[PDB]
Write a protein that binds this ligand. Structure first.
Ligand SMILES: Nc1nc2ccc(OC(F)(F)F)cc2s1
Ligand SMILES: [Ca+2]
Ligand SMILES: [Ca+2]
Lengths: 87, 146
């Protein structure tokens, strides 16, 4: 039988991903431009884009963690269904 | 992607573990009850997401063919050795790879569903390979998962 083995490891989440990923691209570019493509670095500008950058990166991490959570909830149900294979 | 005759019949029995009120469909409400019976706490959106990932006709419920179809995609199983070793490590107070027979009784007779003192004796008899009153849990888990 299966003994101690277990299963091997949505528009809303997709929407969250596309907007956050576009924001990562936007903010990476603006931090790069304001730190490397200017004659004089404006620190207020760099702080603003760093805040927008971290918020976009952390939004993508939040979606990925939610997808891992959903995947394990699904694996839980598949594991429960597989208990019936024990005959 | 492939299921046998015997497996289809057994997954019919499995469908009954989910279809609580017995009407041939799984709703978010029935899914929530089953998930909570397993000590999990999915939110409303997570239950709807689970229904939506497998519901092909978009009626908001899971029928038996949609249920069977998703089981085919995840038939592959994997060994649980590392995860079980990590559960034993929770009780390894000094992180030395050992749990004493005394600490094992203290844990098993007080935490979770519990074992009786007699059941603990049978477990320790098997686990304490060297008869030194100490359990090398990496070795014990490897024995059980072999
Ligand atoms: N991606 C997904 N795979 C599965 C597999 C099974 C499942 O359990 C249910 F009981 F809903 F059928 C939900 C899901 S969501
Ligand atoms: Ca039902
Ligand atoms: Ca359906």
């Amino acid at each position: 039988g299966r003994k101690l083995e277990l299963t091997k490891a949505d528009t809303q989440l997709t929407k969250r991903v596309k907007n956050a990923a576009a924001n990562v691209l936007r903010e990476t570019w603006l931090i790069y431009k304001n730190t490397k493509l200017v004659k004089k670095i404006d620190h207020a500008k760099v702080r603003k884009h760093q805040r927008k950058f971290l918020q976009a990166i952390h939004q993508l991490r939040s979606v990925k963690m939610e997808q891992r959570k959903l995947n394990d909830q699904a694996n839980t149900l598949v594991d429960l269904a597989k208990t019936q294979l024990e005959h | 992607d492939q299921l046998t005759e015997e497996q289809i019949a057994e997954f019919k029995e499995a469908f009954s573990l989910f279809d609580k009120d017995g009407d041939g469909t799984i709703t978010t409400k029935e899914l929530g009850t089953v998930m909570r019976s397993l000590g999990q706490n999915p939110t409303e959106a997570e239950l709807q997401d689970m229904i939506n990932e497998v519901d092909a006709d978009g009626n908001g419920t899971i029928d038996f063919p949609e249920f069977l179809t998703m089981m085919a995609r995840k038939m592959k199983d994997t060994d649980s050795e590392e995860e079980i070793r990590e559960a034993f490590r929770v009780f390894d107070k000094d992180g030395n790879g050992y749990i004493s027979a005394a600490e094992l009784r203290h844990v098993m007779t007080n935490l979770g569903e519990k074992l009786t003192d007699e059941e603990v004796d049978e477990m320790i008899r098997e686990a304490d390979i060297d008869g030194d009153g100490q359990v090398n849990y990496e070795e014990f888990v490897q024995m059980m998962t072999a």
